[PDB]
Amino acid sequence: ICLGHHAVSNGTKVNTLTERGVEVVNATETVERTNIPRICSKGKRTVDLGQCGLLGTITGPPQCDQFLEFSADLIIERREGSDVCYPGKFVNEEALRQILRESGGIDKEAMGFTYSGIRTNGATSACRRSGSSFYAEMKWLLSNTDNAAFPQMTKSYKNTRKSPALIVWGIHHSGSTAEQTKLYGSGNKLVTVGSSNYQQSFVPSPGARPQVNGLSGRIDFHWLMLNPNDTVTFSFNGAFIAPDRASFLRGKSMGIQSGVQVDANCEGDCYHSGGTIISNLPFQNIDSRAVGKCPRYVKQRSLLLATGMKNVPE
Amino acid sequence: ICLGHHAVSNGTKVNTLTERGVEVVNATETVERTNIPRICSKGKRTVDLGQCGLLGTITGPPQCDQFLEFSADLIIERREGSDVCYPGKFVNEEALRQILRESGGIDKEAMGFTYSGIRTNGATSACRRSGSSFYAEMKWLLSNTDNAAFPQMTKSYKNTRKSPALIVWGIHHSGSTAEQTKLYGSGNKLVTVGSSNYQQSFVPSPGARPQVNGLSGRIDFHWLMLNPNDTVTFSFNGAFIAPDRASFLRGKSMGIQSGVQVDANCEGDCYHSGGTIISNLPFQNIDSRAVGKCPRYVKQRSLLLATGMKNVPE
Amino acid sequence: ICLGHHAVSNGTKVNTLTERGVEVVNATETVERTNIPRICSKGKRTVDLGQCGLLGTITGPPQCDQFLEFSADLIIERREGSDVCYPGKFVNEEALRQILRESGGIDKEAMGFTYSGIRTNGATSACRRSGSSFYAEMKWLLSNTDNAAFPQMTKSYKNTRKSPALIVWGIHHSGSTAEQTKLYGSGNKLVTVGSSNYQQSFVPSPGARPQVNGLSGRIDFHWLMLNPNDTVTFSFNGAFIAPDRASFLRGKSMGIQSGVQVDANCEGDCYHSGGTIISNLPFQNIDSRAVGKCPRYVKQRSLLLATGMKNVPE
Amino acid sequence: AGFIENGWEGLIDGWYGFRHQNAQGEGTAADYKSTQSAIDQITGKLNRLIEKTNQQFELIDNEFNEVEKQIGNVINWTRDSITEVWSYNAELLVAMENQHTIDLADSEMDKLYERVKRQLRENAEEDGTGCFEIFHKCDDDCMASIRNNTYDHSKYREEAMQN
Amino acid sequence: AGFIENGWEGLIDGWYGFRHQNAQGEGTAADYKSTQSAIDQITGKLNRLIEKTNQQFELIDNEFNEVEKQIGNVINWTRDSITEVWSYNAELLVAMENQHTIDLADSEMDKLYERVKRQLRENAEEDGTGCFEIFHKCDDDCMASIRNNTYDHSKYREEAMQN
Amino acid sequence: AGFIENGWEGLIDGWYGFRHQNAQGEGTAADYKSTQSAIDQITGKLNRLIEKTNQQFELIDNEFNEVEKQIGNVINWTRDSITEVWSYNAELLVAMENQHTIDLADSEMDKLYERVKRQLRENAEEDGTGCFEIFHKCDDDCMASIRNNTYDHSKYREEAMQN
Ligand SMILES: *[C@@H]1O[C@H](CO)[C@@H](O)[C@H](O)[C@H]1NC(C)=O
Ligand SMILES: *[C@@H]1O[C@H](CO)[C@@H](O)[C@H](O)[C@H]1NC(C)=O
Numbered sequence A, B, C: 001i002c003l004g005h006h007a008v009s010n011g012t013k014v015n016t017l018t019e020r021g022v023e024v025v026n027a028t029e030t031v032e033r034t035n036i037p038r039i040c041s042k043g044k045r046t047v048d049l050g051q052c053g054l055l056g057t058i059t060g061p062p063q064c065d066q067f068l069e070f071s072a073d074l075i076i077e078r079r080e081g082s083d084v085c086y087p088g089k090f091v092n093e094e095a096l097r098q099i100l101r102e103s104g105g106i107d108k109e110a111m112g113f114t115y116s117g118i119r120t121n122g123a124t125s126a127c128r129r130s131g132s133s134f135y136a137e138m139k140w141l142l143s144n145t146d147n148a149a150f151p152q153m154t155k156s157y158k159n160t161r162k163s164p165a166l167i168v169w170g171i172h173h174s175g176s177t178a179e180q181t182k183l184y185g186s187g188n189k190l191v192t193v194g195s196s197n198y199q200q201s202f203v204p205s206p207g208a209r210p211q212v213n214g215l216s217g218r219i220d221f222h223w224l225m226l227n228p229n230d231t232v233t234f235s236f237n238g239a240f241i242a243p244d245r246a247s248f249l250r251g252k253s254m255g256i257q258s259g260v261q262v263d264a265n266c267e268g269d270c271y272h273s274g275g276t277i278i279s280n281l282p283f284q285n286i287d288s289r290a291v292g293k294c295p296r297y298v299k300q301r302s303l304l305l306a307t308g309m310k311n312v313p314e
Numbered sequence D, E, F: 001a002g003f004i005e006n007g008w009e010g011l012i013d014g015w016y017g018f019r020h021q022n023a024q025g026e027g028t029a030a031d032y033k034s035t036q037s038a039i040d041q042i043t044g045k046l047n048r049l050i051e052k053t054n055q056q057f058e059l060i061d062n063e064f065n066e067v068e069k070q071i072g073n074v075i076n077w078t079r080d081s082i083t084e085v086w087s088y089n090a091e092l093l094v095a096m097e098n099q100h101t102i103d104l105a106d107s108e109m110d111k112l113y114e115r116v117k118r119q120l121r122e123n124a125e126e127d128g129t130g131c132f133e134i135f136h137k138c139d140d141d142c143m144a145s146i147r148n149n150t151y152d153h154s155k156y157r158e159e160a161m162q163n
């Protein structure tokens, strides 16, 4: 009587500590290469920002009018998104983006700033609604009439809620010193902001910039995170874009950047710009910058694990 | 005759490459979970800063009067510590903290700055000693009498020692432009600092801030590290907090943040905010931010290593 | 008949999972310790910068006159290199260095800036050529004659090429406000720069600095990366060092810092400041900051791998 | 692949099997309790390696608007380092697991061989190529008794010891 | 756990032992030189794994005053990556070491078995369950000689070969 | 190093060899096909470990002009973490590979032993120290036949079974 083992005519070559190309009966893949070209959002509160930029949801350009108090488990940024209507940018923009991606959405609250002695309805044609408008969450403070001066002002906001408040203001840089005088008067302007963690004033800076949306002026957007019961104060004399409403983080979420469609038919926890990685394998060779709960990225496109015995045919 | 192996009625289940829950005769833990709720400082020069903030040891608020030339192998920061008496903050504060944590202590040296044409005894009620005082290592430069101007000044310090010198100065931001004129006169003030690695002037910025300790003014603290034989110069015309003594790093140390008591009865090289990790195990599941010489942090709370054979009872 | 295995009188001790000091017949080293004290550059376009600093290749001090349009696969920085002739420094200097190290060299293009109403031939004795000169790629803009004013100017450059353009300008900080008036007139000067990614003006700051090369003035160098077809504009009224030529990255390269000689006789892909690491071993204990294609650094100086059987002699 | 110079491509019913040849006829039948052991162990390896992590990683880059060049070079440097670590861990893991799998199957085969050998104390002798020589014609009932480990080690002895 | 269908819970004196049963009486005595070998190897594993590092790591975070949000997200990202690496290394290390420990003990048992087998050349025969059948009543002096590896392989032969 | 209490320092021709001693004379000749197997496997280990990476790493530090202190502390923290990971991986890799190498050579020796044993069915008996006792004076032609695996297992049987 003889006893032995099984074999097959065509097996699968694998690699070991000793050799490279050992035929085995059966083998399975450990590195994931199959990608779903969609954002699998089944069972998640998903907010596709589209033409609205993530930071815009705090300031409120016309493309973000419907995202001012969004709520999400998954936030998707798009390439066509824009944070601004009037040309400008944020200082510490990427840190604010990373804050807003895991915020779970935002909840706005009126800061209750009232004014006496200045104008408050600055608008422009770049922020188009019915006619010429402005950032929905901001207010463009100007002088009363034909130029004239801007009185030294001091406004204070106290965070009465138990979570940190996101405060965002703006410094206007006109196309010239003549336009800066026309808006807020002559002389050096100075905007001071302080709290318990914060301590930084700003100075305007008029001058000609390249025309974006046919406009040469720029608006610098700045932000700080007030703590509960902590108070922030602004001491400004012009070139100031005042905050009307403060923001509060709702809870928790995840943020991704993608260019593929949303699919509520598949579920996935690993996302990249090209879609969703749905796999049980421990490794993947699709995108090293994938985020969420992913298999670990490796450079090898294939690593075959032996699931059968050594194959020795006749 | 029969030969065999031992067994026990109750063994310990472990995990292998193949199974999960294999009974073995004996097993030992590899992930440390037992924590000592004290800072084990036996045999180390320990400095518990308490109410003194680490950065304050350079400027010298009243709570840091006894820490101006400390010497330590282990530096402990406390939650109640404060770097300031007059409200203000440091620029590049965390980098300076990380520098001072491994400094081994500080050694002060008079910079020998003499003045003619200005006042030099600025004080405040927030820095309370006998009466109203100021930062022990700094000098609050003001104008002579009832306001008046501040002459354009230039002071130079040359590091004559073989180790880098820590130089710290301050820019005063009063509550208003009127108070800035009252202290140093009208006109734009400008503070310029230069050396071989450095090149940065500062401009003051008066305005109203939230009252901290009943005061609306702020003091910006700045610092550079002079190299041996390298010279630094200050060109200032007001709103300037002059350095009286420079600092030199003593040697080497470690810095931790904790809220538990000091114990000179136990020895440990791995610290976290909740105490000391004393273990020979290669891994720990206590604090991922532990510092010193620690077992590596892992997410698993337990990983049993087999120290006995397979247990097969009757 | 008896069958057995071989043995030797003197074997090599190695370490296993179980023991430390097991004698084996033969063993080989896995941690590389042998270093070549030269920069092995055989087969690579190598540029040894020498006395020219890497950033200087963009601005063009006299020591970088022969590196204005270099082309390289391997860029070597030297300790004696200098980016400047007139004392100054770059803002975001290390990021620009890391950009230029993997640039593959630079290609210059005239930006075509023409001037009317100002002088354009500022020079100094620190930038020595025939006589007193200046940065070859920059132009020192001054006022017409005996002082006088500097008119508000606006110059625009559009990147017409398909790769990002490196734009570098300079802000002059004289030794005093009197010298600043002498060069560009009195009043606050302001230099504004904008594009699609950029938005930052600068303000000068005269004052006394330590004399470097017998000079107390400093020149701040700033840079942005224009995108294709994107336009940048400068709005300046004095204290301005204008760019004459823009830079474009040639391709790809590697940058190292070293103090050893170049050798075109040996080939290597792993470099450190002390030479080249040529090895097939998977690990090295020479320099943890080695760059290129290196064995991974480990703290152990030796790890012997068993290549023979267990040695059991008589 | 020791003394069994090759495997049986016709054994489609299991991993390890018997192939006897007495005077009654032929026979090839898989041994379910060893095949199920090796299959159970490979299944365990797959259960330990097919694994899902509960650690969420967030975005620290930006594909649409590139971050600061220096912090981006630090981020890319760290990501490349971690990628190297995980590529090494993956290659070494696969290679080691494959080695242990092959050696495991071979070990199962050998232990089965020595088990059948210990069932036949002196009534059979090793041939040298993984087969056993019986010195008495064992019928198919005796074959089935050999398979399910019930063959009597002494109620066939004397007859085979004579031969 | 091969042919020894279970272990001896009454063997409190060592890891591996003998349990004989002739006409003189009973006996169970541990074998010190194999137990000490396996114990020595496990001890070596513990000496290699119980290890202290001389690499000091400093604070780059701040629990009392949070650092910049971006650099804090890079720091947290790196720390989480390293934590994943070390959790993987710890799990894989423990699993592999346990596998090698079990296989090591089993190997020691088997090698002891085949050693005792080679001591009894033809005077005994394998039973099939880890026991040896002696064809001549071996007294307790012969038992102690079997234990300390002094039993004569030919001065008991002929008598057992007849039986 | 099991039943072979020591090795042969005079065997300079190979890793595994034979040393016979009949009435014709002496003889020690290496076995090329097992030595070449172990050598091939060690060679494979060296081919897998001697490895070159195609991952280029760039400079994120500056030895001539030190970078910002905070970003430098983050960089140093990350580099130290990765260095710890690679030192651990290197130590564990070397130790595991050495263990498997030693066990591999021992396994090759044992399998060779049992092969020669299966060649000599009943014409020889195990001595207990890695040697085989032949009960008939086997000449040197029979020795060479034993080496190249051609010795007839039954054309010398009866004579040895009588003895
Ligand atoms: C072969 O491996 C694959 C891996 O996916 C598995 O699904 C399949 O059942 C295996 N086949 C056998 C016969 O074990
Ligand atoms: C916040 O302020 C309110 C009102 O002053 C007080 O009742 C509450 O205890 C404070 N809570 C915290 C967390 O500061």
Ligand SMILES: *[C@@H]1O[C@H](CO)[C@@H](O)[C@H](O)[C@H]1NC(C)=O
Binding pocket: B026, B027, B028, B307
């Ligand atoms: C069981 O393991 C522990 C591990 O700490 C060890 O201290 C103890 O001596 C072991 N017991 C035996 C009987 O080996």
Ligand SMILES: *[C@@H]1O[C@H](CO)[C@@H](O)[C@H](O)[C@H]1NC(C)=O
Binding pocket: B228, B229
């Ligand atoms: C520092 O300066 C002193 C005096 O000028 C000189 O003697 C010494 O050599 C210098 N040392 C260094 C390191 O610059």
Ligand SMILES: *[C@@H]1O[C@H](CO)[C@@H](O)[C@H](O)[C@H]1NC(C)=O
Binding pocket: C026, C027, C028, C307
């Ligand atoms: C011993 O190991 C070294 C490793 O470099 C190898 O070159 C040499 O050939 C080996 N010697 C033998 C006899 O295998």
Ligand SMILES: *[C@@H]1O[C@H](CO)[C@@H](O)[C@H](O)[C@H]1NC(C)=O
Binding pocket: C228, C229
């Ligand atoms: C750049 O501009 C030119 C001329 O306006 C145009 O022909 C070309 O398509 C543009 N390309 C890109 C990439 O913007």
Ligand SMILES: *[C@@H]1O[C@H](CO)[C@@H](O)[C@H](O)[C@H]1NC(C)=O
Binding pocket: D066, D068, D069, D070, D072, D073, D076
């Ligand atoms: C980092 O790598 C990505 C691609 O993985 C690249 O797009 C990006 O430009 C790199 N970062 C820097 C600063 O070059």
Ligand SMILES: *[C@@H]1O[C@H](CO)[C@@H](O)[C@H](O)[C@H]1NC(C)=O
Binding pocket: E066, E068, E069, E070, E072, E073, E076
């Ligand atoms: C990093 O994680 C810690 C807890 O481990 C958390 O307190 C901190 O806020 C995190 N950093 C940021 C920037 O959120």
Ligand SMILES: *[C@@H]1O[C@H](CO)[C@@H](O)[C@H](O)[C@H]1NC(C)=O
Binding pocket: F066, F068, F069, F070, F072, F073, F076
């Ligand atoms: C980082 O380590 C290097 C040496 O490896 C040292 O020269 C440097 O000063 C360290 N960085 C900081 C910020 O101390």
